[PDB]
Design a protein around this ligand. Structure first.
Ligand code: MG
Ligand code: MG
Ligand code: MG
Ligand code: MG
Ligand code: MG
Ligand code: MG
Ligand code: MG
Ligand code: MG
Lengths: 377, 380, 380, 377
């Protein structure tokens, strides 16, 4: 057998704060010193504590215990083991963020051992390139319609200049615009962007009444927006079904969810067009694979939520090549987003050429920490 | 014009206190108002994971420290505060561990609000028309997992003791590591039922040892004659469709939601799981406030609620108040000192409700009628 | 051991007081405790029919005098008392007039319980996270039923006045005896909408003038451009299947349950009527206690609740407290003195909530913050 | 990268007949001479002709064409590429058997290149041992009850002696026994075997009326059989549903089906408790993985049909370890079967101990052709 396939020796959770952007790097190392990198969402110190709890019983075990000593190649089996041993407090919520980080690191570690890029461990690909949609947000107050539009105007011009195939814009949380003003706002941005680029919208959960949201969405149908994200409260699945039944917009769901079980509910009860389960929240690449194959059979697209560091971004590219079932996937690019962690935490940076990425050639996720940057916090 | 109650003072601080005993542990939640008056509650989950969660730093609209939205609020507005805490913590507290922390605070608010207004907690949940409540007691002997004869011999004295004290209902378990075939489990339960007799209701906890509904159905159907009250933790907790199969192909009461959180998961168990009874826990699912919503919803759908309960006397006190004002079933889970091992359960708080003839009388003290036994607590 | 609140005293008597004005009438319900402290509420229905109902003689388990089960109970146990009264009166009070009487008592309990504990009523319903609430005002000019030009001319000054006072939303009605064709109704509403402008939400009450859903659908669909908030009393109140048709074939919000009683009828409107909004009345459907259950149920099903409200300042006070702690919609029905005729509505009780910029601030007085204006009341 | 992961160079379909019994071996060789073995069901000559057709258009392509030149590690991608290019005549039926053989062979090849057993390429395992059910059938005339019961007698006893945990008996096709006689037959067999060993029953499609079958199955509920296979005609899904709705027996389906699309129908329309899609018919291990994960979500067990040579039997052991969701799986063992082909075609044979198999250790499927036996034609 392949000697490089060695059992996991250790797994450490490494908080990384930068003055308030942060993440929790997950490092899994085998007995030969080779290691994989992943990252978990959630308050770094809460995640670190959870990752260091004492095992108490069958359903309340330390998350890393079931992985240490196992062969990194058995990613599916290791996932089941960790999940089963942590049911008392990790079936949903924060605990799943920790499991995600480990699952992610395993694809990077397994890739290095076998000498293959992570997407080849996920089924391989028939695509020659993938194209992300970029989430854009200017450094604005929440501001006024004028400030917001002026702040977006250039990011949108820059996107078109770079031939980005799709972009997502947001409605400022603290903004107090009426739905009539939101429509105007979106019309103005779409006016700036043009119709050759797909445009997604994140309403940041500013609504609670499906009826009002339906009136808004049905009034801007002419804008041919790609989707409507975070319209109603995340727990309001029946409310989302109402939107699907009464509008012609693509309705998204599950951005903050965890596991395929919550994903299944969004599909059947929420009737949503697209799931946004996050790499570093819902159960990693392994759970996103099950979620996506289930989604496909149900005519539901999956565009995993993504706004962390270069670690998740790398996982995102690999996901899109072997698992993705949609035209785009969420990605945060350094030239279209402020944030040092995203910018320098890991290297190298995937090269975006004409709005797309080429197939990964390096082992695993093809990334490593920028010791220099990390050396300074 | 009439002046308002002076005792209804703003909350000044919220403290999470982990308590381990050498294992046995819990997380005491103490909410103190402007005048030094306080309420006690407790949260499930690894005490140190919970402690760290309770001390995180606020980052944005949906990622706030759980206590932040409670500080400065009047303890009497429990429902509003619950919503304030939930909304501000959606990023990592909608489900799982995070809800355990919110649960502990909610529980404490009933105790505190009760003291400020000078009324027992159940009167803040609607009052009661019951004069007494009767819990079912969960029994488990000290047996190594053990074998058939070993397990039966170990349960025997507990079952006789319960009959002697007139306990109206008890729950027995199938040991986790026991490798008994389904037929041996059937034998096992027949033996226990035989020892106990049929005047006492018997619930059974299978400790999630099954994954195939058909096998489980064959089991439960083979023991209808035992007239067991319910079948708990038969299939894996995520297998809601599997529970539905059980309900559709057997005549046993099927339970669910013991490890769940929030009324949203509870609703799914009701509609998709089709279960006859929900076991959402006081210190996990959202405290008494969420249990009230879950129970009123459960009643409308002909579903009983018997909250999971295996912590300290803090949750036990909450359970009695719950059963008097909210409970919609004949029994509710309760762990009694004389019927279990657990120094933490026996000594952490005082006083202890007096079980008379297998029932509890209406609580009379303000709030949850409990307090920390500092000597025990100080003894480490 | 801590002593309980002394102010929480048993209820000693319950009195129903009919009040007519020459027509305008109501039934004041006064609940007095051991120490003379009392709460006010009011019941809908013919005052003399209600009076007689409130004084019937107990005959058997299900045919009891409504007050009997409340007398001797601590006002703080509102939910338990509600169940006690309901269960004992099933023979003739489960629906209809009988529930009006129960509603009045429940409302009074919030006022009384509030005074004993020294807290505003909304704090007994869970508190609030809102700083202000905004009602919609129902407008109707003095017009004989009138004709198109007559009705429009009459509504004009009311609509301008509302805009001047910054009322966030208003409701207009289609006169009952008006024989306008559906096309004339469409014209009518277009005119009113034109006068009002689009910054103020406009609700429409059709006063049950229709019986054919298809005709109604054609109407509502022809006026989508008016962006009306909702369509109330379109089809007959018993026609739940007809409302479903409307919801399925139009894009207007369809209301229901304005004249209904209990959460059981409310549930049917939700599931069978498929309505977007319930209008169960404070003084008809079961008071604030039942409105709380109906609203929490409505929210889970994405249904708004704007309780019907057209009585005296007693229900108006209840409405504000309701909206702060229970309401799940942007507005709620309210009748304001400066926007209506009604000596009973204007003078029966004091003080009057101050509408500032079309909104109400948090109530501060105990209970419902109201009391009988004996001079007015004494003046017959 | 990993030098061993080389492009596929050729794919050969080799008919194997015995003087009756036959199969079609599938040999996929990479650019280094390393190869993987697999087998396809169906008339060997029909299959060979199908594997040698000429590409005509987008949807009518030679099955091997989309695999040649591809890295065998990208099994999921190759599966899609082959399926997509052969839709015109390979979406269902015979065509899928061929695709199945190639898919199976890719797991063996990919396992050899990476130097890991096939099951690790399917997720790994947390099971230490797997236990098959053995399909038994005596060499009997169709015969009378007595004769049939007599033939099964020794086999049953031998099964108990070898501690086989589960066995499947069949009702002779040409047997003209009434439903009452079939019931007597099964009672007699259950008596001989005992209840400590699970017993499955294959009725070989002798019924067409669900009502009659329900009566039979409801009358032998006391025998507590594990399942009822091939009761009604294979196209009669609505009929299987009536069986499920009116009896308490586990009802099987999909034995002769292909693709996860037919399997989904069996689950939702047929309401069956267990699927029997075959490794060498339905789309191979890749499709069995999708079918099983879908089945698990629907509380449906999967025990893939298996009656070919040691090539499929090997694939079956690996399947059960990493993908299987049921306590047993079909297996044909040489000491319990009478097939020269099943015994000699490939080596080595997995060791059955106390009714179970240990985790495979050799790369890929761990089998190879027995040249001598083959040279014997
Ligand atoms: Mg978002
Ligand atoms: Mg489909
Ligand atoms: Mg349990
Ligand atoms: Mg009901
Ligand atoms: Mg009306
Ligand atoms: Mg809902
Ligand atoms: Mg067969
Ligand atoms: Mg399921």
């Amino acid at each position: 057998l392949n000697p490089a396939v060695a059992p996991i020796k250790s797994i450490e959770f490494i908080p990384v704060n930068y003055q308030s952007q942060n993440t929790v790097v997950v490092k899994v190392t085998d007995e030969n010193g080779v290691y994989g990198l992943g990252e978990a969402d959630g308050s770094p110190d809460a995640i670190l504590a959870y990752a260091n709890i004492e095992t108490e019983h069958k359903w309340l075990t330390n998350i890393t215990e079931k992985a240490i000593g196992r062969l990194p190649i058995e990613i599916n089996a290791i996932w089941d083991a960790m999940y089963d041993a942590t049911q008392w407090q990790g079936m949903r919520g924060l605990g799943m963020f920790a499991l995600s980080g480990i699952d992610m690191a395993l694809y990077d570690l397994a890739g290095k051992q076998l000498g293959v890029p992570a997407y080849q461990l996920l089924g391989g690909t028939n695509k020659d390139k993938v194209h992300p949609y970029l989430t854009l947000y200017p450094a604005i107050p929440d501001a006024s319609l004028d400030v917001a539009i002026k702040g977006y105007a250039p990011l949108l011009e820059k996107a078109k200049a770079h031939n980005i195939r799709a972009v997502k814009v947001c409605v400022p949380i603290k903004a107090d615009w009426s739905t009539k003003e939101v429509a105007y706002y979106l019309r103005e941005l779409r006016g700036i962007l043009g119709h050759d680029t797909d445009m997604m919208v994140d309403y940041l959960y500013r609504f609670t009444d499906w009826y009002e949201v339906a009136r808004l969405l049905n009034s801007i149908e002419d804008l041919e927006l790609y989707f409507a994200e975070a319209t109603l409260q995340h727990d309001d699945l029946s409310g989302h079904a109402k939107l699907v039944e009464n509008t012609r917009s693509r309705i998204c769901g599950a951005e903050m969810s965890t596991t395929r079980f919550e994903a299944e509910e969004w599909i059947t009860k929420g009737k949503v067009h697209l799931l946004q389960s996050d790499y570093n929240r819902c159960g990693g690449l392994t759970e996103l694979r099950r979620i996506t194959e289930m989604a496909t059979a149900n005519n539901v697209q999956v565009m995993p939520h993504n706004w962390k560091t270069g670690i998740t971004s790398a996982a995102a590219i690999h996901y899109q090549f072997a698992v993705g079932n949609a035209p785009y996937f969420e990605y945060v690019h350094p030239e279209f987003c402020d944030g040092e962690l995203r910018k320098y935490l890991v290297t190298p940076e995937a090269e975006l050429v004409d709005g797309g990425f080429a197939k990964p050639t390096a082992p695993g996720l093809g990334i490593d920490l920028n010791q220099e940057f990390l050396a300074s916090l």
